[model samples]
Target: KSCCSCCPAECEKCAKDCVCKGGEAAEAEAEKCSCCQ
Candidate 1:
């Protein structure tokens, strides 16, 4: 299927693209508690 998926970064829109991941890294991802697959 072809469509646009809206995934917010860091659970927010004003975030970075790498925010899709989480860890002790300097940049954290959108909290899993806030999003899911």
Candidate 2:
């Protein structure tokens, strides 16, 4: 299928492309990502 597949970077990209509904909680969770930096 011609769709985005799952990978570390792909998932990260997907997440980065979203406007997370979790608000500050999600923002904090994302800020704690160890492998991203």
Candidate 3:
């Protein structure tokens, strides 16, 4: 449910949050995020 469902800027924020703050389980979760793709 990424791509912000509207805003593209939010997607970048998500990417940063995903890889940065994200941990082990979080990395797995980030992989499924279609927004960054």
Candidate 4:
């Protein structure tokens, strides 16, 4: 928990960064998200 963390962007993920949301969008994140791959 020592290392962590974006800008004000549309986040469709299940993470501990910004104040975004997830669920169906999280699945979509898996595709559009480059980090997911």
Candidate 5:
């Protein structure tokens, strides 16, 4: 079971870590994250 949960703040960090533009972009990517599934 994937236990990854992404919130805007968390996703922003994730995006920054991954070199993606933080903010809404990160939130968008977070929505597609399968880790929550």
Candidate 6:
């Protein structure tokens, strides 16, 4: 899966890549967020 921006605040949301909202990366670009700087 690929990583992208979800929160407009630029806040991290996720740690590792995994299934998001029962969908794949292609289906959900912003499915997951990063909690890292």
Candidate no. 5 TM-score:
0.17
Q: Model 6, range 1-37, lDDT digits (tens) per residue?
A: 3344443343334444422334345655554443442
What does candidate 4's lDDT look like per residue over 1-37, in tens digits?
A: 2121322233444345533233356334342333432
> Model 1: per-residue lDDT, tens digit, 1-37?
2111434334343243333333354665433433234
* Candidate 2 C-alpha error for residue 5, in Å: 7.4
Model 4 worst lDDT run, 10 consecutive residues: 1-10
Cα lDDT tens digits, model 3, 1-34, are: 5434333455665655543332346334443333
lDDT of 2 at 27: 38
Model 2 whole-model lDDT (C-alpha atoms): 0.36
For each candidate, what TM-score against the reference? 0.15, 0.17, 0.18, 0.16, 0.17, 0.18
Could you give the candidate ranking by lDDT, starting with the highest? 3, 5, 6, 2, 1, 4
Write down the lDDT that model 5 would get: 0.41
CA deviation > 4 Å runs, candidate 4: 1-13, 18-30
Each prediction's number of clashing residue pairs: 0, 0, 0, 0, 0, 4
> Which portions of model 1 miss their true places by more than 4 Å?
1-15, 23-37
Global local distance difference test of model 6: 0.40
lDDT of 2 at 34: 29
| Candidate 3 off by > 4 Å | 1-10, 18-37
TM-score quality measure for candidate 1: 0.15
Q: Which candidate leads in lDDT?
A: 3
What alpha-carbon RMSD in Å does predicted model 5 have with respect to the real structure? 9.3
